[PDB]
């Protein structure tokens, strides 16, 4: 696992302001990035040319909070209260 | 686990927004992995095969 999985890359960007092309250096994963033409020292982001990459804000979280699907009025959600249920077929211990 | 102790680096593309990245790696450089008891796992595979059969 020493093919260059972590890569140290440089690039010029315009800042908050259009009066500064700051040559910045950052780190990338070998999968997250893809080379161009001959393998020079040059790469490009894995899907930059073909997609719209959006940095998920760090303020948010992907934690899997459990969830219940509460049913509306005049409707009902039933349950198979069996131990070993096939998945398809008739139930026996059923409840609302 | 991802064993690496990483450092946040906010490069501000702006105006009121920045792109965060790993500034550096504090310590050794290591590989991410997942540990599971092979006894538990393959004794679990025993559970499966009999109900697969």
């Amino acid at each position, epitope marked *: 696992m020493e093919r260059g999985e972590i890569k140290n890359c440089s690039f010029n960007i315009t800042t908050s302001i259009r009066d500064k092309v700051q040559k910045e250096y950052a780190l990338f994963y070998k999968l997250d990035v893809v080379p161009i033409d001959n393998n020079n020292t040059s790469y490009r982001l894995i899907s930059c040319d073909t997609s719209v990459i959006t940095q998920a804000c760090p303020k948010i979280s992907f934690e899997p909070i459990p969830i219940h699907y509460c049913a509306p009025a005049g409707f009902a959600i039933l349950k198979c209260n069996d131990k070993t249920f096939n998945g398809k077929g008739p139930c026996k211990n059923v409840s609302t | 686990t991802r064993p690496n102790n990483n450092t946040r680096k906010s490069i501000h593309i702006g105006p009121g927004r920045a792109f965060y990245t790993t500034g550096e790696i504090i310590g050794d*450089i290591r*590989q991410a992995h997942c540990n599971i008891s092979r006894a538990k796992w393959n004794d679990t595979l025993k559970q499966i095969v009999i109900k697969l059969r």
Partner: antibody
Amino acid sequence: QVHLQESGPGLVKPSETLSLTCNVSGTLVRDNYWSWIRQPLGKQPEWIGYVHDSGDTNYNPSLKSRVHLSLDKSKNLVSLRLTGVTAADSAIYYCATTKHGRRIYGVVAFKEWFTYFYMDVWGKGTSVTVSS
Amino acid sequence: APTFVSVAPGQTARITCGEESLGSRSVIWYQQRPGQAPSLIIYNNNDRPSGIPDRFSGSPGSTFGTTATLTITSVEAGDEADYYCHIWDSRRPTNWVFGEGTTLIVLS
């Protein structure tokens, strides 16, 4: 009791090969990993390279093109041969056993360890001069 | 490094060496009495071979952003020498030339 001593010519013109030797006593020459070291007057010691019976033999990257090491079961010594010498090569050259260790920091399964050497007991020192 | 700390007998000497750490290092130490072969002092970072007392101790190669510090406790006369490092870092490649000859000198 275990100890050793090395020998040399003392002086060498800029051309030709600097050949050395290193007697061994108390322990066998095969069993140990051997390493030659040189140090100019005042300057810091400089690792030159190491060697084991199998021919497992790597050198300092700088002097790599010049240095040529070897052993011998009969004479039981450490035979260094530095070719194409220079004024800079004037130094005192030590002979020393080497002990090795594992330094596992991550997971042994996929490298994540480095192997380091240390030389436990040195010789006396052999002087070298490189003058016209 | 043309450096030399001066200490009094029965006092403590902090003799540092090498550049700052990156990964887990293993730093072997050496002592050089004037005109004598350098006796080995410590391996990897704090353990020592036969003959070296408990006065000697070193920086645990397990922290990052720290130089190699060799402590000589309650120093005496014979401890005077030129001390060196053989630095083995996880991220920085092999050191074939030794560290700086930090020269410890007693004061009394």
